Amino acid sequence: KVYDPEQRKRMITGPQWWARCKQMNVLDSFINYYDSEKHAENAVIFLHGNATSSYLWRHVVPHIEPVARCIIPDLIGMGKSGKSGNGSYRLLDHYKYLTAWFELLNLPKKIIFVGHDWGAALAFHYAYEHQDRIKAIVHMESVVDVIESWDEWPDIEEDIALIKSEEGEKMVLENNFFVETVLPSKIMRKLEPEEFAAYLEPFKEKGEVRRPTLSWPREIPLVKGGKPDVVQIVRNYNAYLRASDDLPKLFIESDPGFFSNAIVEGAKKFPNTEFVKVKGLHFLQEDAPDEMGKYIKSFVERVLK
């Protein structure tokens, strides 16, 4: 892992990105977000997932802004957003706040979603419960289905067992496992110090402020061992999507990826999926942002014509 030579030239630091955001109160808290505003007959909502924030998409978004309004939130208790009122950050806690925030955005009827990780989960579940509000869905390293077996997955079974135990609190709240260990480990390049600090910033202090990054993984839809409600949520939106022939989709494969191999075949069962591949591990936006924006822009444009 080395620095890209020309990366400092173009680096957007967290504060430079925070300066380009705005806030909006949502129920009893608030949501920090980026919004390109223009071309609002359409909207593309970019959803980060665990460990990260809207900052993740900062070099991806410029490619698509020309063709459509882009909107990128910091998920509740992440990035520079407000905390959850009850201090709980499960998927449906996240859905609650996000759905409430959409109401305030002046979105079109048909929305374009772009999701990564649990951002994809959130996307897929909004789709399921608003099947008349979706124009297209792009996903990557996503929670496509429940899990029956670890076979095609990277060796994280024991990491997951541990996270589900009382050990997870030590990993994440004391030791910040997802920012300090998983994050840099799952980018091919090395992040600029300023870039890594903008990911740390939210979760710089020890303890409970780090909760969101521990809660997400505990949602994991394992048939044997998972929370049965999230297992139902996923299973439900998985069947919907399997049947969703007239819903144009895009899958961005990550190569070698982190669990792109695990989920690709699940992705294949969603009809109307265009398949592209880029270089990366789990957090591909930091290894192929432009290849990524290009593929996305192309897709969005084909889906508006």
Swiss-Prot record:
What's one GO MF term for it?
carboxy-lyase activity
What name goes with this protein?
Coelenterazine h 2-monooxygenase
GO BP annotations, alphabetical order:
bioluminescence
One GO cellular component, as annotated: membrane
Summary of pH dependence: Optimum pH is 7.4.
EC number, UniProt record: 1.13.12.5
Source organism of the structure: Renilla reniformis
Record's Pfam families?
A: Abhydrolase_1 (PF00561)
**Classification lineage:** Eukaryota, Metazoa, Cnidaria, Anthozoa, Octocorallia
Function noted in UniProt: Upon binding the substrate, the enzyme catalyzes an oxygenation, producing a very short-lived hydroperoxide that cyclizes into a dioxetanone structure, which collapses, releasing a CO(2) molecule. The spontaneous breakdown of the dioxetanone releases the energy (about 50 kcal/mole) that is necessary to generate the excited state of the coelenteramide product, which is the singlet form of the monoanion. In vivo the product undergoes the process of nonradiative energy transfer to an accessory protein, a green fluorescent protein (GFP), which results in green bioluminescence.
The entry's keywords: Decarboxylase, Luminescence, Lyase, Monooxygenase, Oxidoreductase, Photoprotein
